Design an enzyme around this catalytic site. Structure first.
Site, PDB file in Angstrom:
ATOM      1  N   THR A   1       0.865  -1.159   0.000  1.00 17.64           N
ATOM      2  CA  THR A   1       0.000   0.000   0.000  1.00 17.64           C
ATOM      3  C   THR A   1       0.913   1.223   0.000  1.00 17.64           C
ATOM      4  O   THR A   1       1.862   1.264   0.791  1.00 17.64           O
ATOM      5  CB  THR A   1      -0.892   0.127   1.244  1.00 17.64           C
ATOM      6  OG1 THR A   1      -1.648  -1.030   1.570  1.00 17.64           O
ATOM      7  CG2 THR A   1      -1.886   1.190   0.900  1.00 17.64           C
TER       8      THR A   1
ATOM      9  N   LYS B   1       2.275   4.767   0.986  1.00 17.17           N
ATOM     10  CA  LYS B   1       2.236   5.524   2.232  1.00 17.17           C
ATOM     11  C   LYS B   1       2.945   6.861   2.043  1.00 17.17           C
ATOM     12  O   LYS B   1       3.926   6.867   1.288  1.00 17.17           O
ATOM     13  CB  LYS B   1       2.935   4.772   3.377  1.00 17.17           C
ATOM     14  CG  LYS B   1       2.295   3.441   3.753  1.00 17.17           C
ATOM     15  CD  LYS B   1       0.835   3.583   4.170  1.00 17.17           C
ATOM     16  CE  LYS B   1       0.282   2.174   4.158  1.00 17.17           C
ATOM     17  NZ  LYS B   1      -1.114   2.129   4.518  1.00 17.17           N
TER      18      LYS B   1
ATOM     19  N   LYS C   1      -0.819   7.416   3.940  1.00 19.06           N
ATOM     20  CA  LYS C   1      -2.144   7.026   3.476  1.00 19.06           C
ATOM     21  C   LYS C   1      -2.785   8.132   2.645  1.00 19.06           C
ATOM     22  O   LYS C   1      -3.256   7.902   1.535  1.00 19.06           O
ATOM     23  CB  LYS C   1      -3.075   6.716   4.644  1.00 19.06           C
ATOM     24  CG  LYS C   1      -2.640   5.611   5.588  1.00 19.06           C
ATOM     25  CD  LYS C   1      -3.603   5.529   6.769  1.00 19.06           C
ATOM     26  CE  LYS C   1      -4.955   4.952   6.390  1.00 19.06           C
ATOM     27  NZ  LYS C   1      -4.799   3.546   6.072  1.00 19.06           N
TER      28      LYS C   1
ATOM     29  N   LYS D   1      -0.754  -0.722  -4.435  1.00 13.85           N
ATOM     30  CA  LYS D   1      -2.163  -0.376  -4.375  1.00 13.85           C
ATOM     31  C   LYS D   1      -2.418   1.002  -3.800  1.00 13.85           C
ATOM     32  O   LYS D   1      -1.536   1.646  -3.219  1.00 13.85           O
ATOM     33  CB  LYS D   1      -2.901  -1.410  -3.538  1.00 13.85           C
ATOM     34  CG  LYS D   1      -2.476  -1.497  -2.084  1.00 13.85           C
ATOM     35  CD  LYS D   1      -3.124  -2.621  -1.300  1.00 13.85           C
ATOM     36  CE  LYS D   1      -4.631  -2.605  -1.171  1.00 13.85           C
ATOM     37  NZ  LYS D   1      -5.077  -1.439  -0.406  1.00 13.85           N
TER      38      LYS D   1
ATOM     39  N   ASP E   1      -4.334   3.385  -1.154  1.00 13.01           N
ATOM     40  CA  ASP E   1      -4.848   3.000   0.148  1.00 13.01           C
ATOM     41  C   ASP E   1      -6.348   3.162   0.067  1.00 13.01           C
ATOM     42  O   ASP E   1      -6.872   3.910  -0.743  1.00 13.01           O
ATOM     43  CB  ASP E   1      -4.484   3.923   1.282  1.00 13.01           C
ATOM     44  CG  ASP E   1      -3.959   3.300   2.568  1.00 13.01           C
ATOM     45  OD1 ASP E   1      -4.594   2.545   3.164  1.00 13.01           O
ATOM     46  OD2 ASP E   1      -2.893   3.707   2.992  1.00 13.01           O
ATOM     47  N   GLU E   2      -7.067   2.341   0.837  1.00 17.45           N
ATOM     48  CA  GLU E   2      -8.520   2.343   0.812  1.00 17.45           C
ATOM     49  C   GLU E   2      -9.221   3.687   0.877  1.00 17.45           C
ATOM     50  O   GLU E   2     -10.334   3.834   0.388  1.00 17.45           O
ATOM     51  CB  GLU E   2      -9.047   1.462   1.947  1.00 17.45           C
ATOM     52  CG  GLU E   2      -8.942   1.916   3.407  1.00 17.45           C
ATOM     53  CD  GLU E   2      -7.574   1.978   4.038  1.00 17.45           C
ATOM     54  OE1 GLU E   2      -6.888   1.151   3.787  1.00 17.45           O
ATOM     55  OE2 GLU E   2      -7.328   2.891   4.810  1.00 17.45           O
TER      56      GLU E   2
ATOM     57  N   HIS F   1     -11.228  -4.573  -0.453  1.00 22.87           N
ATOM     58  CA  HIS F   1     -10.585  -4.210   0.795  1.00 22.87           C
ATOM     59  C   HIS F   1     -11.741  -4.247   1.788  1.00 22.87           C
ATOM     60  O   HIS F   1     -12.718  -3.511   1.624  1.00 22.87           O
ATOM     61  CB  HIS F   1      -9.972  -2.794   0.702  1.00 22.87           C
ATOM     62  CG  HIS F   1      -9.534  -2.235   2.055  1.00 22.87           C
ATOM     63  ND1 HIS F   1     -10.346  -1.775   2.995  1.00 22.87           N
ATOM     64  CD2 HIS F   1      -8.251  -2.169   2.560  1.00 22.87           C
ATOM     65  CE1 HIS F   1      -9.632  -1.455   4.044  1.00 22.87           C
ATOM     66  NE2 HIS F   1      -8.372  -1.687   3.777  1.00 22.87           N
TER      67      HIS F   1
ATOM     68  N   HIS G   1      -9.108  -9.230   1.867  1.00 27.35           N
ATOM     69  CA  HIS G   1      -8.131  -9.239   2.938  1.00 27.35           C
ATOM     70  C   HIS G   1      -8.634 -10.234   3.972  1.00 27.35           C
ATOM     71  O   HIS G   1      -9.783 -10.144   4.398  1.00 27.35           O
ATOM     72  CB  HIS G   1      -8.022  -7.891   3.590  1.00 27.35           C
ATOM     73  CG  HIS G   1      -7.170  -6.862   2.872  1.00 27.35           C
ATOM     74  ND1 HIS G   1      -6.021  -6.378   3.315  1.00 27.35           N
ATOM     75  CD2 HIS G   1      -7.468  -6.222   1.694  1.00 27.35           C
ATOM     76  CE1 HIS G   1      -5.612  -5.470   2.472  1.00 27.35           C
ATOM     77  NE2 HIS G   1      -6.486  -5.383   1.503  1.00 27.35           N
TER      78      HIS G   1
ATOM     79  N   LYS H   1      -0.265  -6.231  12.498  1.00 29.95           N
ATOM     80  CA  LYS H   1      -0.800  -5.254  13.441  1.00 29.95           C
ATOM     81  C   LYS H   1      -2.308  -5.367  13.647  1.00 29.95           C
ATOM     82  O   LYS H   1      -2.870  -4.745  14.562  1.00 29.95           O
ATOM     83  CB  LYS H   1      -0.437  -3.837  12.968  1.00 29.95           C
ATOM     84  CG  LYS H   1      -1.072  -3.401  11.660  1.00 29.95           C
ATOM     85  CD  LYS H   1      -0.609  -2.041  11.169  1.00 29.95           C
ATOM     86  CE  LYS H   1      -1.443  -1.678   9.947  1.00 29.95           C
ATOM     87  NZ  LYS H   1      -0.958  -0.465   9.320  1.00 29.95           N
TER      88      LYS H   1
HETATM   89 MG   LIG Z   1      -4.651   0.182   3.492  1.00 27.18          MG
END
Ligand SMILES: [Mg+2]
Ligand SMILES: O=C(O)[C@@](O)(COP(=O)(O)O)[C@H](O)[C@H](O)COP(=O)(O)O
Ligand SMILES: O=C(O)[C@@](O)(COP(=O)(O)O)[C@H](O)[C@H](O)COP(=O)(O)O
Ligand SMILES: [Mg+2]
Ligand SMILES: [Mg+2]
Lengths: 472, 138, 472, 138, 246, 138
Positions: free
Chosen positions: E58, E60, E62, E86, E88-89, E178, E211, E218
């Protein structure tokens, strides 16, 4: 007030109703049909012929005065000749004439709705077979005819003088899109002109259609670059609804495929719709006659395949399977010759031995390419050329993929066999008799063919034909 | 590669003896005979160069052999093919086309894969020799 | 390198290839088919059954190594039982099982492409008939089923407890649009629920379709206002291409017609496309089985109509002609009962006498209304109710229009006869035996019926049925 | 006109004796029996007024006759029909519906023809009595 | 399906807590669903990557990067060896970066990386948007540019997911889901819906990736319960196993 | 460049010892083993040339090593890969594919950027060696 004449209420026989007329002069605009009628015991053959004519045109079981509101005499179909079938006392050949005005222009559906609509289940007739039809020049001109046609097809492929070679991918069901493309690449590179989907390969759990189309087109173009030939694979667009078929056909169009295929089982309206689409989008349309032998196998009932050949040449199909004489599916040499003539010739001449009961001009509609497929192999090549001629697509599925040294080797074997055979034909050699030796001689230079000849050497399909001539 | 365009290209290159017999076939079918050549053998290259004018009423095969050999002498490193045309109403097209001369070595074709919408590709096939000017091919 | 095992190149018999397995346990997800196989002299019945199973699923005539690239063992169809036909030493009943994964969801075309695709023309089989099929619950749920269905149809018409009455306009061909509307008005006002186009009435020189639709709808609405009933006329949308069919269907939709009709002859893809259209546009879809008897008449070859009944109930049709036992078309009482059960029941029970070889749950797909038509008349009413039951459309073409006192009188005669008969049935009278007297009693009050009974009194159609049971 | 909605409306109006036999039929088929009425007999008037609540487990036909006669007494110049419903899974609908009371004279229906595109007409059928308020009909 | 099963019963006063743990969806019902547009097997065939897990990343931070800078990160990561990168959502179309720039610059980076490695590369372009028309616009532009994959967030809802699953099948696009918002109801053992139920519903709906947790990362993921999730997504037949909650 | 197609191409080129252990893995999973080769390593070149027919029931790893080495001997300046296929119902695909031979030097790829509508580009990736005929590559 109540009527008093030929139109007074009551049941009178179909022969008395005007459907039997031995003195009728056939007008050049009439649609003529030949039926093989087996009446029930006790039913006079003339009454049975009249019953068939009546119920395929204007009559019902009782007198209806409403006939008087129409030009009834013109619209009634007339059975004009009844002859007995040569070696069968129960069967009769009935010639019936139908006026042009009874039919909708350009519609196979409307034609069949009258000719085969209800009469085959009529109690008074024990059995009934539609043998042949004379479709008049004026009716024929309302039809498109083949989208491409043999001549234009060969020009788009740049392949002339020899039969074309094809192959159905095997196993029939179960391969993935990726693996389907593998087989296509190998066979086309090896020497086949075409490879095809099997008729029941559409879109299923093991392989949906879009993968197969994408992977196949990659394989087709790789093969083309590897050979310097125009190559193709019949992408099967058969589907449950018209919209779904259009979606598949249009994707094939987008990818640059030279050809697509449909199955007879989609039906006449879907076939006509796709024939128009193919003409408008420069696509060769192959028809697989799936379901055909459900009605064409038996001599006493159903419809003879030459009738379907006429209707499909009219509809606009570019290829139709017309049988191999020596393969695993039914094909009497003399009757199969009639089918091939129906598809390829500009004018048909009456020949009782082939079952061609009428002379017929084809109104310059394009020629349909016959496809010969099923249980054939190199080795039979000399008689394939002899019975089927030059304009035919010879398809070897098992005859290619079943080869021990691989698919490319199978394809080469078939291609070399074909070329050696028509080279010999062109040199005026008696290839029918010398055939085994022509193949053996070519096999000395081509190991792949030698192995193919050894493998399938004794494979023959000697069985009694069901659909046979009545004049032999 | 060996270009397999033409009716007999999976067989060995035909000897003049074999070509003569094919011309006899064309004569018995009253075909017009044409000789064409190119150094761009793309499958879709529909119009090869014509060597003169098609020989129409041919009685003697030797006349056609003479022209095939004349073309071979003037265009040695070209693809040459013999075409037979039928003017009969249902046909009005070529009914036989076969290669009678090939250059000493054929490179083959390049395949271009242009990525288009999603996984769709637009393809270009181009012969390697046609990246050279016409006068420098083969 | 070359293979050495079951997959080495060569021809081995279909029974050895894995298509014969007498120990196979039928999975609830399998499509099962029953074939009546007549092998050629010399072919072992087990090999013929295996050949049919093989060629309708994955096999070809020679071994192909590519099977190994698939889960071949699962995809092979297995003939699991071969029994001999009770009084015929040449015929065998072969039960074959096909894995669910072989079929495309919701597609009659894909189903038929495997089951009836090529096997009927296979040289080794002299004759072959598809008798019945068990379509599994999981496959059935991918189909729409009837657009309207019997129950909803009766709710939209507000007609319950009695058969519905219809009439094909006669003469079959030749009337103008204006005159077609005349007949429709008279018959509907006189007491029929429906009138219909004849299957071959589409758009022709004597009458194009738009006039007929406009004039018919005027007649339908006049009749409705004259009776206080919902009335309808089956407008025939059969045409050569899908676009032309859609044009006709959409115009019928625009005019407010409650029903349209199509002919089987348009084919499976066009039928499925119209079934979806009917569901989406609140239209009752009537199917006329034109061309059906081309393959369903003879016991030794073709396809039995109960199979077509299953496929069409799946496809989504609302009415299909299923025969009259006593009419002018073929219909053995016991075999016809099986057809009616297939169309109307939620679950089918195995009954060898009716030819129902498999138990089958219908996955709550709606019921198809059977249509009984052809050569019937009031007088036969008591046995029509007895053989066909309550949920059926009884159609009297000639039986209405052939009446001497006019079309309204014909319609009334039929309507009064129907109602008197089911009133008597509901009163627990033995209407089969007392039938002539029930009709005679009602005729005393209704002159139109008296005349109808006198006119067609002796008209009977006593002929030997071709499609008969094997267990009687 | 004579409104021919209902299963037996081409026959004479059923006597109580005949109705009783029809109720026996409904009871043998375990149908729920409902009595409905209206003075708007438009064919498309799907919802007639219900006379009470449908009688569900009926053993004695006389109970239903009593309610039919009670409805006839309270709604003499109305159309009254008896409906039989089957709760069986494939059905879940009415399987019989017949008229048991008609007003003394039925006027019939008006047909309205509104001209729309080209020769297309949009039709309205309306009963003549429904041009009068509900309390003044028949 | 959900309107009946989870419609009203979770707020019923008589029940203090209620959790939907698992469901057996019958063969006949399952066949009315499309299932994954591409599916694992076909996906690997289109990528020509087999035998190993696929690697993604992802981008970053975000939020906050521009389209140009997003493409920088994509190029570097793909060239360096990742198969995918990708959005980020929550990267959709915002003041700092609207979507069309990101799509254009990302596709340049994807194709440069592909030419630099000899691999099929991809970047999950996020088509999540407020209305269906806006989602279709984004999806169709990704289609036009030749992206092998797009992504959606669970938060668009079930009807939008089903609509996009059909679109992906019809347009040869890998569809990544996601599961944004999932743990709002799946974290607590006493109430909500266990994620294996959502795995079944989404495999039915037609999503190609979802996912399913890392055990050691985490976010929440008990090894035994996570194994059940993976089996639900990957296996042809599920066997009852009380330890996994199947 | 180093073409990183294949399961282990970020690792050093596998020794025969390492390849043997991978073939043992394929044998324990009952995979059909195929050997394929090309000199057009475009990522989208889905069909590499097959070296013979896939070895189906393999018990001894040495048989596969022999064929890999035979392919390497006959196609030294080609990319060669070993493929393992599983016929199991949910899979029916390749589950491992790794490079076992690479030419001495890989040029890389050309990137073509054709300008289309607005800022949209249509891309063509083409390996530099595939601008040379097949017989002249690497
Ligand atoms: Mg994400
Ligand atoms: O499915 C088959 O059996 C074929 O693919 C032949 O396969 P093989 O080449 O492997 O035998 C053809 O469709 C049949 O020829 C159709 O029959 P017909 O040509 O008589 O219509
Ligand atoms: O054309 C006819 O003959 C009919 O209109 C009946 O007319 P009549 O009522 O005037 O006899 C029907 O279409 C046939 O019943 C169809 O046969 P089937 O019902 O067996 O499909
Ligand atoms: Mg086939
Ligand atoms: Mg009719």
């Amino acid at each position: 007030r109540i009527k008093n004449s030929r139109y007074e209420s009551g049941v009178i026989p179909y022969a008395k109703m005007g459907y039997w007329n031995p003195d009728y002069q056939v007008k050049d605009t009439d649609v003529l049909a030949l039926f093989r009628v087996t009446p029930q015991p006790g039913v006079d053959p003339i009454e049975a012929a009249a019953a068939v004519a009546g119920e395929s045109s204007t009559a019902t079981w009782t007198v209806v005065w409403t006939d008087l509101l129409t030009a009834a005499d013109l619209y009634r179909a007339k059975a004009y000749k009844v002859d007995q079938v040569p070696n069968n006392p129960e069967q009769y050949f009935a010639y019936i004439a139908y006026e042009l005005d009874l039919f909708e222009e350009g519609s196979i559906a409307n034609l069949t709705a009258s000719i085969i609509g209800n009469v085959f289940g009529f109690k008074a007739v024990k059995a009934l077979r539609l043998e042949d039809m004379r479709l008049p020049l004026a009716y024929l001109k309302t039809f498109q005819g083949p989208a491409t046609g043999v001549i234009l097809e060969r020009e788009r492929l740049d392949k002339f003088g020899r039969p074309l070679l094809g192959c159905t991918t095997k196993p029939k069901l179960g391969l993935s899109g990726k693996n389907y493309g593998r087989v296509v690449y190998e066979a086309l590179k090896g020497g086949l002109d075409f490879v095809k989907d099997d008729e029941n390969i559409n879109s299923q759990p093991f392989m949906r259609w879009r993968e197969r189309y994408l992977f196949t087109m990659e394989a087709v173009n790789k093969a083309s670059a590897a050979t310097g030939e125009v190559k193709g694979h019949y992408l099967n667009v058969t589907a449950a609804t018209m919209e779904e078929m259009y979606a598949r056909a249009n994707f094939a169009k987008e990818l640059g495929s030279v050809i697509i295929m449909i199955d007879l089982v989609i039906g006449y309206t879907a076939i006509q719709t796709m024939a128009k689409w193919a003409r408008d989008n420069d696509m060769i349309l192959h028809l697989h006659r799936a379901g055909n032998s459900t009605y064409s196998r038996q001599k006493n009932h159903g419809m003879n395949f030459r009738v379907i050949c006429k209707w499909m040449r009219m509809a606009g199909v570019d290829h139709i399977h017309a049988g191999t004489v020596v393969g695993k599916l039914e094909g009497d040499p003399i009757i199969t010759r009639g089918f091939y003539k129906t598809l390829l010739l500009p004018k048909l001449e009456r020949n009782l031995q082939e079952g061609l009961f009428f002379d017929m001009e084809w109104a310059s509609l394009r020629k349909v390419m016959p496809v010969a497929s099923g249980g054939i192999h190199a080795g039979q090549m000399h008689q394939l050329i002899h019975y089927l001629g030059e304009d035919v697509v010879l398809q070897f599925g098992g005859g290619t993929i079943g080869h021990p040294d691989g698919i490319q080797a199978g394809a080469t074997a078939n291609r070399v066999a074909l070329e050696a055979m028509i080279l010999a034909r062109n040199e005026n050699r008696d290839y029918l008799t010398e055939g085994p030796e022509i193949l053996r001689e070519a096999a000395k230079t081509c190991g792949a063919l030698r192995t193919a000849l050894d493998l399938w050497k004794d494979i023959t399909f000697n069985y009694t034909s069901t659909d046979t001539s009545d004049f032999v | 590669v060996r270009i397999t365009q033409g009716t007999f290209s999976f067989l060995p290159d035909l000897t003049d003896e074999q070509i003569k017999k094919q011309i006899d076939y064309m004569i018995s079918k009253k075909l017009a005979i044409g000789i064409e050549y190119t150094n761009d053998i793309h499958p879709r290259n529909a119009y090869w160069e014509i060597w003169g004018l098609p020989l129409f009423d041919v009685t003697d095969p030797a006349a056609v052999l003479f022209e095939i050999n004349a073309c071979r002498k003037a265009r040695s490193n070209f693809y040459i093919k013999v075409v037979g045309f039928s003017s009969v109403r249902g046909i009005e097209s070529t009914i036989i086309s076969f290669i009678v001369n090939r250059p000493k070595h054929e490179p083959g074709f390049n395949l271009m894969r242009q990525e288009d919408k999603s996984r769709s590709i637009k393809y270009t096939i181009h012969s390697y020799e046609s990246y050279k000017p016409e006068d420098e091919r083969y």
